[PDB]
């Protein structure tokens, strides 16, 4: 039984970063050549693991996180990064083991008029913990005190990406998939094609 990476990388719709989505990949044969033989990836890099050697490895479990970010924000999807994406939307652990893949999706995520369906959080009281997710949409106050706009000093915590088919590449939309490699003291559930 092949691991369902197609369902992940080829999903018709992708979520916003702040509402990032995780699929558990487990108990299956991972044929990573599907990512080798597709040559559209503009980010493809791994931590604790050689990117080209994935078919030779077994993992306890693989987690696939999908979301969309601005081109210039892709770099925040790494261990130890700072910034509003990495501190308020999606944070990888210092000791991350896995891979980050990204590809330019101008032709399906951007528009002449501008696509504003994709959002990120930019106001928050305290940074996210690694792999933590915050999908609330609560008026934000620097007092921390609850507030009801139009009250003063009361702000909305999300903001839109505006994805236009005519901007520079750093502003165009990128679909991101993070693969987390879990290592436990047991048999492995996700192995490569000829490993058992």
């Amino acid at each position, epitope marked *: 039984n092949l691991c369902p990476f197609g369902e992940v990388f080829n999903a018709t719709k992708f979520p916003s970063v702040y509402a990032w989505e995780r699929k558990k990949i487990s108990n299956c044969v991972a044929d990573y050549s599907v990512l080798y033989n597709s040559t559209f990836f503009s980010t*493809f*890099k791994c*931590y604790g693991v*050689s990117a080209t050697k994935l078919n030779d490895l077994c993992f306890s479990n693989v987690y696939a996180d999908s979301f969309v970010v601005k081109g210039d924000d892709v*770099r925040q999807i790494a261990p130890g990064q700072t910034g509003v994406i990495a501190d308020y939307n999606y944070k990888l652990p*210092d000791d991350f083991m896995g891979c980050v893949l990204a590809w330019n999706t101008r032709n399906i995520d951007a528009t002449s008029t501008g696509n504003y369906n994709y959002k990120y959080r930019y106001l928050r009281h305290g940074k996210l913990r690694p792999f933590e997710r915050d999908i609330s949409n609560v008026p934000f106050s620097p007092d921390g005190k609850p507030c009801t706009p139009p009250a003063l000093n009361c702000y909305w915590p999300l903001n839109d990406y505006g994805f236009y088919t005519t901007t520079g590449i750093g502003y165009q939309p990128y679909r991101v998939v993070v693969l987390s490699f879990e290592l436990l003291n047991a048999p492995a559930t996700v192995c490569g094609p000829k490993l058992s």
Partner: nanobody, 127 residues
Framework: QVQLVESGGGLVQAGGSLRLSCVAS????????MGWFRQAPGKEREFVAV????????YYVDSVKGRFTISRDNAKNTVYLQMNSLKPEDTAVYYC????????????????????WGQGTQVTVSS
């Protein structure tokens, strides 16, 4: 955040040798491919060398093949750049960089493709 501190730079006569070191903080050093870049006067940061997380694969810019050799010690959180047969062309600030193990080797030579960067150590090779 992982911090990178270079050392071993300094002043050396043409024909001589230096050995640069870069120490990372934390315990996560062995996840990363470790690179060296350099910046000569009037030039962009240029790739010099990389070694992957496990020490087994490594690449060099052509102008240093056979003179420079990169190595690492995951036990000491330290990447090394052995520099022989130095020439004035090697005069530059040498920067350590930490990033992911890349699927395309060419990506290793793009400074912006790494995750962390040192503040550099100066190397001057006098004629």
């Amino acid at each position: 955040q992982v911090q990178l501190v270079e050392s071993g730079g300094g002043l050396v006569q043409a024909g001589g040798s230096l050995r640069l070191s870069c120490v990372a903080s934390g315990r996560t050093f062995s996840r990363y491919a470790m690179g060296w870049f350099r910046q000569a006067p009037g030039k962009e940061r240029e790739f010099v060398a990389v070694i992957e997380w496990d020490g087994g694969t490594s690449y060099y810019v052509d102008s240093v093949k056979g003179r420079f050799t990169i190595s690492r010690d995951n036990a000491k959180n330290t990447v090394y750049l052995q520099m022989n047969s130095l020439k004035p062309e090697d005069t530059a600030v040498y920067y350590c960089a930490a990033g992911g193990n890349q699927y395309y080797s060419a990506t290793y030579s793009i400074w912006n493709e790494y995750d962390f960067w040192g503040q550099g150590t100066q190397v001057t090779v006098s004629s």
